[PDB]
Amino acid sequence: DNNAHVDNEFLILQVNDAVFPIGSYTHSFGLETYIQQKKVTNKESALEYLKANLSSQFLYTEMLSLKLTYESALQQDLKKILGVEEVIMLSTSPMELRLANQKLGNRFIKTLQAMNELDMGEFFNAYAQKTKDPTHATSYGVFAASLGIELKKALRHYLYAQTSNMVINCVKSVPLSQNDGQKILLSLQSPFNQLIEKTLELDESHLCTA
Amino acid sequence: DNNAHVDNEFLILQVNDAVFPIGSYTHSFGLETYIQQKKVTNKESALEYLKANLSSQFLYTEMLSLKLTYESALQQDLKKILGVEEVIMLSTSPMELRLANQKLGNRFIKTLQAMNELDMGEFFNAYAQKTKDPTHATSYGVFAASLGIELKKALRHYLYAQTSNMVINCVKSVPLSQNDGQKILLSLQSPFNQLIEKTLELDESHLCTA
């Protein structure tokens, strides 16, 4: 195998690392308002905001989209993958967020491709050639499936990385102490498991329904 | 169990996250010289410097110390843990690096302890009460053993986090392109596995022998 020298246990850490050079996650977009309006003011209200957000659009769009493209990639169904990306593109507002999401997806793909010693396989190659509105979550789904990374593991690492980013945004913006940030992340571990279990129960009919 | 709500699969990500608030890793200390002297000038020479460093003091002090305190914690042998920390303290130069390492170890312990909803167990509590010269690796070893995290997994996450930090330091300092940084990390995956296998073969008689 061309990937004999590749260890997915490290590669999954690598692509979820904050330094993986694809630009910043976009979760910060709809947070500034909550802070200005005195909605999020402390650890308690930050946690409630995070739990609500994680279980709404983050779940029914981002996490679910990852699961859907992962599953479709295993079936080698590019048409369904492009279909999922189309639904997301047509559902995302405002335009600035859509553009930021598309930029992030494109950068994720390009960053993988720049690692010439990593063979993503023909299906991924074709996905990269055809995608019009990639997102980080959908492209990551195809990536994980392509390399044979288990779905639940792929979801756990992605979920943690996204949520770490969300929490640090609250830490910096509210602001909160660093200790409060760590308490929040610890408090989110049970909800994380509930989110993954729920994600596995959903399907295309639930996509973008939050 | 007091830790019913804790999921080690997320907690291991949390404590290895660059945002875990303990201050910067100290690997950058002995790098500035290599760059000034035109020793590390590109991707190729950065990789060789990293491979050499990973297989020398990083292996025989840092990785091995983690393994040793993990093993001793399973045996509930605090005396041996303090013994390992003593050897490291007495072997580390210069004084500024020693102080930085001690500060990092102390911060790791304190950061864990500030998460009141995490029960580290009596052995860890006693370790925290008695440690004089903690380091990140030794305290992490006791932490991982205390929570029942498998040793090879604990080592993989720690190794990746440390090396990501080392690579980004080269990226910024040489400087290198971000793409070169990712190629280096990918190239290190086989060496990573060799390092972990070697770490498992070593014992107290090898500590600080590089």
From Swiss-Prot, chains A, B:
One of its GO terms (molecular function) is nickel cation binding. Keywords: Chaperone, Cytoplasm, Nickel insertion, Virulence. Its main location: cytoplasm. It comes from Helicobacter pylori (strain ATCC 700392 / 26695). The gene is ureF. UreH, UreF and UreG form a complex that acts as a GTP-hydrolysis-dependent molecular chaperone, activating the urease apoprotein by helping to assemble the nickel containing metallocenter of UreC. The UreE protein probably delivers the nickel. Belongs to the UreF family. This is Urease accessory protein UreF. GO terms for biological process: metabolic process. Disruption phenotype: Cells do not express urease. The keyword Cytoplasm applies. One of its GO terms (cellular component) is cytoplasm. It is found in: Cytoplasm. The lineage of its organism: Bacteria, Pseudomonadati, Campylobacterota, Epsilonproteobacteria, Campylobacterales. Required for maturation of urease via the functional incorporation of the urease nickel metallocenter.
